[PDB]
Design a protein around this ligand. Structure first.
Ligand code: PRO
Ligand code: PRO
Ligand SMILES: [Cl-]
Ligand SMILES: [Mn+2]
Ligand SMILES: [Mn+2]
Ligand SMILES: [Mn+2]
Ligand SMILES: [Mn+2]
Ligand code: NA
Ligand code: NA
Ligand SMILES: [O-]
Ligand SMILES: [O-]
Lengths: 481, 478
């Protein structure tokens, strides 16, 4: 069957991946007792956009649910699936003659049918007529709340849809649940995105020199992933104190610090291949040699990383892993002399959240922060740190998670803790003072839950010895200029 | 005063640039009979956006009119200018404490005042109260039609604005006209963007090898511009027949470059929201064939004829027609066409080979504002109707000059089926050029008192291009 491919050494992704997803969605819907026979799932693809009132185009990236179901890269499409038969129909725009001059060849419907391995292709302007001829009981459309953004999914609409019976409640939780569990075909893509990002991280570690701007390394990473991996979307490079800023690198903070001798670097890179994401973070000394303090903090996060990975298997409650990481960080910070006292009491006082204010990790898939973390019946825990978890679910096979503990020295959180007598007694101010401005360390792996444990997708140097050896290497193997 | 800078060898852009723009806008408004005392210009900045319903952020880029006036990179701002005094006030978001954890330091209002060299800074939620205290006669907001997209500019609005007198007709044509004429400070940025893009084009010409994918060169170009130029925002990379596809869209150009192909690399991007757009064409294998030399030198001739003719007072559509005539003459000189060139022009044959406009205003947007102000009409003829301006040239305008010749099957076939055009085409020679793709040579220029200032600096002659691709230093002169 056909595949998506960007040539060279990039991955061939079979269009069968999307056919399987369509089948899985139908199977799940057929089991839902509220679903009427003759129902048709209706999804609307993304459209091309421009910057404000200008004609400057914005890079088109397909909407994630639509991509999951169809793998279609073209703007302006819709896609429908007959629930009872699984039959798929793609609707493509009927394009003007002038498209041939400006945009490219005008493909036939048959070309798209072959390309996407769908059962039928029609033009978008005929969607009402085509759906009418099929005499559906109900159109199932997508509407629900994303629990990371709080946004409501945009429901499909077309001229004449008001003449149909439309349900916008059933679909969302079902398609979300399908997305939560990755098929073997999806896992092949995620292994590939991890391979490329892992190689690109190694290249950054080999290339970093004191005196460079953070964005110079961002640029190199993106160049590797695009030119060698076909990862066009490679869109957090934080040195020194910036490593404590959790989403550093936005327009408010555009990666323009000069990397200095003595800095810790935290390079968190997210990107995608054919709308399949990966998200990997490496931390390393800018000058290639960990100091004693850097080694201590780094190895504390290595410890929690590997303890969590070693504990993960089906039935494990993700908030328990978050609390495990907190406890280990507190133990290690006490060994370093930053903290003193009973670690049990530190945990009761939520001291771990002072050093790791974000969630331990999140579902990963078509979105970097993937859907389904908080389905109905799964509640967010209203405690420091835990409230930032992007899922409070128990692990099951096929889930793909980031595992991303970190320790940071964040002045406003440290200062709050020092003002609070329940927490201040644990903090040794004179030792802590030396770590003001340290920034932070985060170690982020992508893993898949298996029947008995996990499969680690990421492959980057991780021990102090491995990282120092990587950075000291002479073989960059790719020098642009 | 303060400047924007990305360190290393990147350009320091003084915030004084934006102060000058504010002053020029106020001076223009004061001469406008529709403008009364006590007026305040009110602009709303862009906000951060996300991908569909996800929390995936889209890289924030400031709205162009707001950038032109204020140079502000942060999302969520507003900006106002008292017309009578020129006094500027920037409104910035009042941030949540958690911003400090996730996004970075929460800067004081004083920090922003110093950073942007404005007269006052306030929080966005205080805008109604602050403007009420100034007792303005009228708020002048932005509303108008962009003549390239057809979109209507987004007018500022805030909670409480309905208690003010608002006019949304006066500002747009005036701020557009200010943008049309570049200041010396703006030209310094456009010289820089052209320098970086020109260097990146040279690197692509040096690196390109048969067998590469088009997107490998796109990637290399972007890497140069970002790592060496700080140009984070960068892109038609068309090999073989793809060079005839004018906007070949935002996805990887994934054709394998083949021996004998012509390449057309059209790159547009920006530094601190100031654009450049440069197109270079060259043979993939580094050696022009005779046919490739002929088509290429035809576009080189039109490029240079237009650049030599441009000066204040010239009507831009006349330059488009000059390019068409030169293309037709040269296509006849290579045997593709025969007959009278005067007759070919009368039949609009030039548009078969160049269906797009000769060139466009450039500035904060690649297709910059102000091409078709009130009274300036689009010419309803093939080719000319695609011009993005029909204005007369005046000093301070920045234009692209981008003639091209393409072999586009559906246009050639229309001409062959049209008795008014068919007899000019020699099928026996033309057949050799089917699938050739095309050549475009795009320079960025400033209109000056004496003619033009060429901003772009890339190899252009056949010999210069072959020398570049063979790895010669820039200083080498064939
Ligand atoms: O947003 C999140 O959940 C992770 C933790 C900080 C960086 N990315
Ligand atoms: O859009 C335009 O006006 C020019 C001509 C083709 C490429 N850019
Ligand atoms: Cl022919
Ligand atoms: Mn990350
Ligand atoms: Mn992550
Ligand atoms: Mn261009
Ligand atoms: Mn252009
Ligand atoms: Na190194
Ligand atoms: Na203490
Ligand atoms: O992350
Ligand atoms: O262009």
């Amino acid at each position: 069957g056909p595949s998506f491919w960007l040539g060279n050494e990039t991955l061939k992704v079979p269009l069968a991946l999307f056919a399987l997803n369509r089948q899985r969605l139908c199977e799940r819907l057929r089991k839902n007792p509220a679903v009427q026979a003759g129902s048709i799932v209706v999804l609307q693809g993304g459209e091309e956009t421009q910057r404000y009132c200008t004609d400057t185009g914005v890079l088109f990236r397909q909407e994630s649910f639509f991509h999951w179901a169809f793998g279609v890269t073209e703007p302006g499409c819709y896609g429908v699936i007959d629930v009872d038969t699984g039959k798929s129909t793609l609707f493509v725009p009927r394009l003007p003659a002038s498209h041939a001059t400006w945009m490219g060849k005008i493909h036939s419907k048959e070309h798209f049918k072959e390309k996407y391995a769908v059962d039928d292709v029609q033009y978008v302007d005929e969607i009402a007529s085509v759906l009418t001829s099929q005499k559906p009981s109900v159109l199932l459309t997508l509407r629900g709340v994303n629990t990371d953004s709080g946004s409501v999914c945009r429901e499909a609409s077309f001229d004449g849809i008001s003449k149909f019976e439309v349900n916008n409640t059933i679909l969302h939780p079902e398609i979300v649940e399908c997305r939560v569990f990755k098929t073997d075909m999806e896992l092949e893509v995620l292994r590939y995105t991890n391979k490329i990002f892992s190689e690109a991280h190694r290249e950054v570690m080999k290339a970093v020199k004191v005196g460079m701007k953070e964005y110079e390394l961002e640029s190199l990473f993106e160049h590797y992933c695009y030119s060698r991996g076909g990862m066009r979307h490679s869109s957090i490079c934080g040195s020194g104190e910036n490593s404590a800023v959790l989403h550093y690198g936005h327009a408010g903070a555009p990666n323009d610090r000069t990397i200095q001798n003595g800095d810790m670097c935290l390079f968190d890179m997210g990107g995608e291949y054919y709308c399949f994401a990966s998200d990997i973070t490496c931390s390393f000394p800018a000058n290639g040699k960990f100091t004693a303090d850097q080694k201590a903090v780094y190895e504390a996060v290595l410890r929690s990383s590997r303890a969590v990975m070693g504990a993960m298997k089906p039935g494990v409650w993700w908030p328990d892993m978050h609390r495990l990481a907190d406890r280990i960080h507190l133990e290690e910070l006490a060994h370093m002399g930053i903290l003193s006292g009973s670690v049990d009491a530190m945990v009761q006082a939520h001291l771990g959240a002072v050093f790791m204010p974000h969630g331990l990790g999140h579902f990963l898939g078509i979105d970097v922060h993937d859907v389904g973390g908080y389905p109905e019946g799964v509640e967010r825990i209203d405690e420091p740190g835990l409230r930032s978890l992007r899922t409070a679910r128990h692990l099951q096979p096929g889930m793909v998670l980031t595992v991303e503990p970190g320790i940071y020295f964040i002045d406003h959180l440290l200062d709050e803790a020092l003002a609070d007598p329940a927490r201040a007694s644990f903090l040794n101010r004179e030792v802590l003072q030396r770590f003001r401005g340290f920034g932070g360390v985060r170690i982020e792996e992508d893993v898949v839950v298996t029947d008995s444990g996990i499969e680690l997708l990421t492959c980057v140097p991780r021990t102090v010895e491995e990282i120092e050896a990587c950075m000291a290497g002479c073989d960059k193997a790719f020098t642009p200029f």
